[PDB]
Curated annotation (Swiss-Prot):
PROSITE patterns: TRYPSIN_DOM (PS50240), TRYPSIN_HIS (PS00134), TRYPSIN_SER (PS00135)
Purpose of the protein: Serine proteases that hydrolyze many proteins in addition to elastin.
UniProt-listed GO biological process terms: proteolysis
Principal subcellular localisation of the protein: secreted
Protein family membership: Belongs to the peptidase S1 family. Elastase subfamily.
GO MF annotation: an example: serine-type endopeptidase activity
Enzyme Commission designation: 3.4.21.36
Cofactor-binding details, from the entry: Binds 1 Ca(2+) ion per subunit.
Catalytic activity: Hydrolysis of proteins, including elastin. Preferential cleavage: Ala-|-Xaa
Keyword DNA repair: no
Residues annotated as the enzyme's active site: H45 (charge relay system), D93 (charge relay system), S188 (charge relay system)
The protein's name: Chymotrypsin-like elastase family member 1
């Protein structure tokens, strides 16, 4: 997250760190949202590689013991069947991970609240992106979880020529684009939390930014629109 502030430890308890095995250690690669005690919602593109993955819940600082972490292997990966790795702009950038164990809920570990199917937010709706992604374009991952206030940019504006044009689909949510704050590599798969009727819900799964850079004016961060996939999500959990 570029232009973020450090999140309080208990603000976003559904945020997870998706990590891969790298030699004798584990490396953060993406975010995710805990949606059942044994299911995580993330981006399809985060799990294209043939890697070994684990999920960390209750995580705050990737580089130090927080006293709150639970580490769990990934047992099954269900990518949206229409996902195509060579075409992120087509959408469908969403995947569900079944965890090998059910995690224990507490102040640091909670299920993310999902929007009702079909819900579209009004332009300029208040949202926060969270994650441990790069804190600058071509920079390095955050140690501590970051948040940044990224108001939505509706489809009409986001798909206009000076924004993302045809690249953005109505199955996506755009947010930010102020040239200061943005998601960035390593935030992919994580939540966009938006305040609606007094309650934050996870409206987006972080998907992509400009090839030009993370914080680029009129290139808001783009997220898979969770509310476009509620039936798909329910169907997968029901059948697995
Ligand atoms: Ca830690």
């Amino acid at each position: 997250v570029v232009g973020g502030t450090e999140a309080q430890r208990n603000s976003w308890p559904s945020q997870i760190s998706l990590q891969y095995r790298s030699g004798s250690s584990w490396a953060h690669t993406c975010g995710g949202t805990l949606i059942r005690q044994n299911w995580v919602m993330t981006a399809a593109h985060c799990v294209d590689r043939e890697l070994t993955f684990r999920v960390v819940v209750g995580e705050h600082n990737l580089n130090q013991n927080n006293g709150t972490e639970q580490y769990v292997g990934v047992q099954k990966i269900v990518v949206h069947p229409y996902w195509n790795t060579d075409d992120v702009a087509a959408g469908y950038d969403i995947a569900l991970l079944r965890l090998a164990q059910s995690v224990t809920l507490n102040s640091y570990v909670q299920l993310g609240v999902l929007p009702r199917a079909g819900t579209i937010l009004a332009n300029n709706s208040p949202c926060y992106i969270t994650g441990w992604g790069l804190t600058r374009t071509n920079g390095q991952l955050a140690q501590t979880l970051q948040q940044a206030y990224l108001p939505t940019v509706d489809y009409a504006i986001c798909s206009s020529s000076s924004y993302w044009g045809s690249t953005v689909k109505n199955s996506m949510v755009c947010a930010g684009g102020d040239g200061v704050r943005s998601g960035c590599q390593g935030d992919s798969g994580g939540p966009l939390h938006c305040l609606v009727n007094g309650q934050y819900a996870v409206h987006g799964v972080t998907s992509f930014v400009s090839r030009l850079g993370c914080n680029v004016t009129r290139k808001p961060t783009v997220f898979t629109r969770v509310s476009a996939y509620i039936s798909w999500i329910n169907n997968v959990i029901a059948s697995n």
